[PDB]
Symmetry: D2
């Protein structure tokens, strides 16, 4: 038929960068395998703990595994930690004390941080009530970091510097590890004291290093994203320097507990095995992302990133230029998704945002954005984020089905 011959062409087009992703996967897989080897993980580690959850070799060892791979000295990846926003809250509060300041050097971070930093809700337990400053240095009009403004913002009370890797809904390239390495070296030059924290959601195992490999003191994410293999039903993670993880430990739970208690329950296997599959599962979403870009190019739509552009995370978006074209697409996806095909997506009023958005996401786990989900704010020139993919076959079948429907 009509569609076949062009997807025949796009795949023949992107072979170069596709073959390449397979590499960083192999690499990423290899490293993972060596940590498992080095830590001699046995099914003995899949053993559940109850009550207080003291003496959980599985938990303690999974934490030292992640931390190994993520390039860090210490790891705190437990089911307790409910998500990746909870993690960053933890990381943030775990380190900030009255009279301090967090300095975000990437500009306004994703919405939810607003609320943590008490600039949204009137302080529900925020920095605002713990007298903890917060500053969001904007980006160059060109999308780089305002190193001038950053240098000027830093001072004695700047306890902590923030960096968000993936762009999200923000209008700028998702920051590379290399761009992140330059970053910490800059600020640390001005004040070696500061702890540098990076929010590493969406960026895991899509490059061959994570921010800790290059001088970050803490980072975090969600397991319902990349490092999860699409198998971990919840949780987050915090890996970094032994002493700053300590404080994330006491913060999460309580003084007198730190990171020694909290039962595993039946959660420990799916995390190991998700992490083993992670580099490859993330691989699948990336080779999908890039095909999405290569495909909607030909069909005649501004895609971003462009397919032949480097990638530091799983963000990808296309401009349909037409409202009715967007919505049909995002519905095509929700119908091509595995679970909940039948719950077709319509325009929803978005709290905060004076526009309506459409949210396509038919995923095995609630909000596991490692799985295929399309969505975007209803407004010109009609950009809908279409990312995720547990298997390349899925992403390929999905957006093939998305063009069938609306073509």
């Amino acid at each position: 038929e009509k569609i076949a011959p062009i997807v025949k062409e796009v795949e023949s087009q992107i072979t170069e960068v596709h073959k390449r992703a397979d590499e960083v996967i192999e690499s990423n897989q290899f490293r993972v395998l060596e940590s498992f080897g080095k830590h001699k993980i046995s099914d003995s580690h899949f053993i559940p703990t109850t009550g207080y959850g003291y003496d959980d070799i599985g938990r303690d060892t999974l934490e030292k595994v992640y931390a190994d791979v993520f390039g860090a000295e210490a790891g705190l990846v437990r089911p307790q930690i409910i998500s990746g926003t909870h993690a960053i809250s933890t990381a943030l509060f775990g380190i900030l004390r009255p009279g301090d300041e967090l300095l975000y050097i990437t500009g306004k971070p994703y919405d939810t941080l607003e609320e943590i930093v008490g600039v949204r809700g009137k302080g529900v337990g925020s920095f605002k009530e713990y007298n903890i400053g917060y500053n969001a240095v904007p980006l160059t009009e060109g999308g780089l970091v305002d190193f001038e403004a950053v240098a000027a913002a830093i001072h004695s009370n700047t306890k902590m510097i923030g960096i968000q890797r993936s762009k999200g809904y923000a209008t700028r390239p998702s920051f590379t590890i290399s761009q992140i390495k330059e970053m910490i070296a800059f600020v640390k030059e001005i004040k070696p004291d500061v702890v540098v924290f990076v929010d590493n959601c969406y960026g895991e195992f899509i490059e061959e290093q994570e921010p800790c490999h290059v001088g970050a003191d803490l980072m975090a994410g969600s397991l319902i994203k990349n490092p999860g293999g699409g198998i971990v039903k919840t949780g987050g993670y915090i890996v970094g320097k032994e002493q700053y993880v300590e404080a994330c430990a006491y913060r999460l739970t309580s003084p007198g507990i730190g990171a020694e208690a909290g039962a595993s329950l039946y959660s420990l296997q799916e995390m190991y095995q998700g992490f083993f599959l992670a580099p490859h599962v993330a691989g699948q979403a990336l080779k999908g992302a890039i095909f999405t870009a290569a495909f909607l190019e030909k069909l005649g739509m501004n895609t971003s990133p462009a397919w032949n552009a480097p990638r530091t995370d799983l963000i990808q978006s296309v401009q349909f230029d037409d409202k009715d074209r967007m919505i049909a697409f995002c519905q095509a996806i929700q119908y091509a998704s595995p679970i909940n095909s039948h719950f077709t997506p319509y325009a929803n009023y978005m709290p905060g945002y004076e526009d309506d958005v459409i949210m396509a996401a038919g995923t095995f786990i609630q909000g596991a954005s490692i799985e295929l989900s399309a969505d975007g704010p209803i407004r010109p020139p009609y950009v809908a984020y279409v990312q995720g993919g547990l298997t390349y076959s899925h992403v390929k079948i999905a957006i093939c089905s998305a063009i069938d429907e609306l073509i």
Copy 2:
């Protein structure tokens, strides 16, 4: 029962005499077990709980009807408006932290009036360790107001110690290892109404561990603004593998919840996974499972008394929690006993306990604990400081049989 074991034939006649003695208090414990059991049933009716409530959620944990509702059921029975009982709170000591921090801000003072709080509040209030995210580094004040020499609340000292900075008042219900009576709801209704007068602002917080479903009313019934505990304890029915509840006034709970999770997130997230049945069900059985452990304290109280040891509380004494101790007066007798209790349990009976050095305490201690869960102290257990006159805390029990059988087995094994 089955005294057809070993020496236990001189024993048989005495238990047969004891049980006939404590029939009075057993009847009445059975009653509040009814009472309490009944409140639980009618609350379940009001919230129309179904197996639709046992439904697992995953991912972010939004829209968890089973979770939210368990929450408003714990609150309903513990006499509060809002609650927070979920796996996230990983224990009893977590909840109390959460509780305190969830409400305390820089400039404030916590005021404990029930005297020195059990060991591990030290670390929280940051007078033990340090740099551990304690009150120390948050400028949050704290004071343990000591009790009377008679083990009452020094009411004069309490008033003397409450200034406008006092944001939060502390009340520990269970005596623990403290040489003082476990304060009663009555003692606690007069307690909070006192400070409430001096400072109608103070937020009264009670620590309700071991006390749950052993009077016909909990702290939130009598004015407290916040209480908590562990689920591997009473309200768990010996069935819940872990947790920690917080119950109290809509908005104090709220602030706790944001402390658990994060600002903006609040309480409305965090997946259930598979934990929701054992909790509904631990709760429904609870008032009974504690009932069995409470009658246990009474049987050990009457029995050891006869055999010639100071027990505490005495069998005929009134009861607000499950604590119980016997004065063996001898090191080798105490240890043989605690060991026999470890051997009388269902799991690990064979890991026999010995004296091990207690960090912080200048004495060794011994610990019996053969529990179906790790550290669930609703189950039979025993320990104590190895120091004259050799008091060992023998408390807990899933079934009255088990307690009975158990401390009998110990006396039999005290044939040496």
Copy 3:
């Protein structure tokens, strides 16, 4: 009501005092026995460890299977989540021993409907004795509920591989059979035909006497786990215990020839089965001390009940005579609403597949069909006898039936 009711229940209890301590005696003696056996196999929380895939070498399971054995007076023990129901155990147990050319001889009379299907006297022989060339005969009881030892001993010819004996009464108007009653039974047939394998469907019977069928000479015995032994705490399963070469014969019907008892992933269900077993005596005790009350509080209210409160117990069955349709129905309704879960899910007269009469069924239960919990049910027909049996705690059973009597008066 409520102040007209209380003096009566205070006077029910004050009368049932002695029978209550007796029900306790046997709890202590049964709970003490489970302790010893636990004590014996050094069981630990390392016996709860989950197993997946093939479930090869599962110390956790196998040892649980031993325990169940030593406690029921049998050699081996086969008890696993795979056994999805009591019916399955018995199906597994019967088929596992019976071979083409053999006959089963139930002597405790017409077994409950479900065996009607497995043997193929009812259902269209969907894998029934009929299809495997196996005969089945039940000897009808005496007019007074005893066993017809004459019709028994004349029906045991050379083709009688197996004896069948149902302990609990079911909906049958004959008393449940006691551990002594059944000991007489097997001694009888083993004399006539030492070959016969004697089997006992022990459902509802576990931990209500200080012994079980296999303690008095039975070759094999099966039941549900979401009932008595599971302590209300386990979520699925079923047990067959008995002699070495019968259980392992069982093993080959459940899994498959060559697997035996070596395979099967426990997964997540170990701890509940152990702990259930440990609470089981005390829990099965609450439904017994609950039943007798049902019998002595309902008697005092001028309604025939059975067994009598002072009647010696062997299982958990308790029935009460309402004598009026609306009365009976209202009561069971009142039970459903007095239950921990699904109290709003009020039940009525339904049609029931394979019963000339409607049935009313109250089932406020945490576990689907765990007949260890308080349930009220029975066939809506004169003289309107309902079964009010089960109850996870004495209180529950007291509070509910008290509430039942309430909705009757108003």
Copy 4:
């Protein structure tokens, strides 16, 4: 890797050689996965099908429907895919027995089946509930020396009593190629002609989703497998499936649970989501392992040793083998494999006695699920010419990395 500058250009050449075979395994990946998606779309599956059921396992719309999806996608009317079946071996004996009655005969036409089926017929089992005690006969038409089915022998060995035809897709240790959906089509067609009365059953293990069809798409009456293998995605922790015609599965249902009950009962507990998501993932997971075999063949052959099937050989299943031709090499490599596995890598294995085998076998299984052969496992008996099985793998990489490491690890 230490010795990895002679290997990198070689595996780089293995790949550039197998380029087309891979794309072709992708084709049927896409084609298989689209089909699973379709059938989900059809039963409108939701996160409410994931819901646990305890006790009698009644009113369990999650289980039963999950069966229909399996059936649909496998081209059968009905399915009995539930945890109550503990493995493939059980799926097969539940199904064999679920249909065979006294006086009946089983005629396996693909020659001698894999060991464990012996223990079920009473050929080794000492008659422990085997066909023998129910007066059921069993026979196997031994293949031609050419590896094909001896049709002349088949047609004579079918008499009025032959209730059931047995066909085994995968090869196991049988020195004969695993048969294809096509080879199998001709098979059922023959026998249905000779006796339209026969019920033809296919032990389908290791084949599911490796072709664009399955046995009941080409006229099979009934097929079994294990869930911890292909169809389970590598993600399901226990199970097994029977799929096929209405009145066989239902019959099968009655052998499994009980007469009178059928498929009505059986508590799911906490297992629905993994079986569902295992199924959506399966087509792709099986691909990573098939893309592995192809490779292992095209890499080990270049290194001199016989591989079988050949890398370019058309595929019907996941079984792969490599002739090492020296005992030591065969051991070291299987050890090399074990260590390259995610879990149990320090659990180094050797030649030890094997119950039921005149030889010792060495088994490297660093799997997550105990015996789930969908994960990379190396194993094989120690005897000339020392052919080993280096098969399975959750991801192509794992597979590449591992054997690459094993070559390094010795050569």
